[PDB]
Amino acid sequence: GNEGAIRDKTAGRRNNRSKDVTDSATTKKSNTRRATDRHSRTGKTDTKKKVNQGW
């Protein structure tokens, strides 16, 4: 509880300030996938009969 929280060193600002900052902080967007956007993953395909029945 609150006694805990004030008494706990390894807490508060000074302690953080003195730690190194990770590199994933200064990362970048990620992106993951995009030049696959037009490439269908479904592996299924339709078929000229089903399409011709539909449309």
């Binding site: 807490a11 508060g12 600002r13």
Partner: protein, 145 residues
């Protein structure tokens, strides 16, 4: 106003409330380099003391300075409202103080300590060197400590 004169009369620099105060500033503001005397306080105190604010810290009789202090540290007696005061309703004796000079540091210490000693979140928050008035802390103040 008027082309003035005087002689050796005015001495530059003068020391009140355990601090120092420059001459050659418009007195009202001189009083400000003391802790706990914002421009308003100074203004009203000087008006109450019966002083010519047109004067520098420069001139001013010794007497005058004395009165100025007396009122500065006994506001409630020399009819200053009490909503004008930095420490109304103590929290123990409940009187109203206008804590001044080297003592306002103490009073800050005191209050912060009371919060810490009682384990109150505000206290913990202080102890941690963080912002206490609820502001977001992701983005602001990173130059910091």
């Amino acid at each position: 106003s008027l082309v003035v004169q005087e002689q050796g009369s005015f001495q530059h620099i003068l020391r009140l409330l355990n601090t120092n105060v420059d001459g050659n500033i418009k007195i009202v503001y001189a009083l400000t380099t003391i802790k706990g005397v914002g421009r308003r306080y100074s203004n009203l105190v000087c008006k109450k003391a019966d002083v010519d604010l047109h004067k520098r810290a420069g001139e001013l009789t010794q007497e005058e300075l004395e009165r100025i202090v007396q009122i500065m540290q006994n506001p409630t007696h020399y009819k200053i409202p009490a909503w004008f005061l930095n420490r109304q309703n103590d929290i123990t004796d409940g009187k109203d103080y206008h804590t001044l000079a080297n003592n306002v540091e103490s009073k800050l210490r005191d209050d912060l300590e009371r919060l810490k000693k009682i384990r109150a979140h505000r206290g913990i928050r202080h102890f941690w060197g963080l912002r206490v008035r609820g502001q977001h802390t992701k983005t602001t103040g990173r130059r910091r400590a």
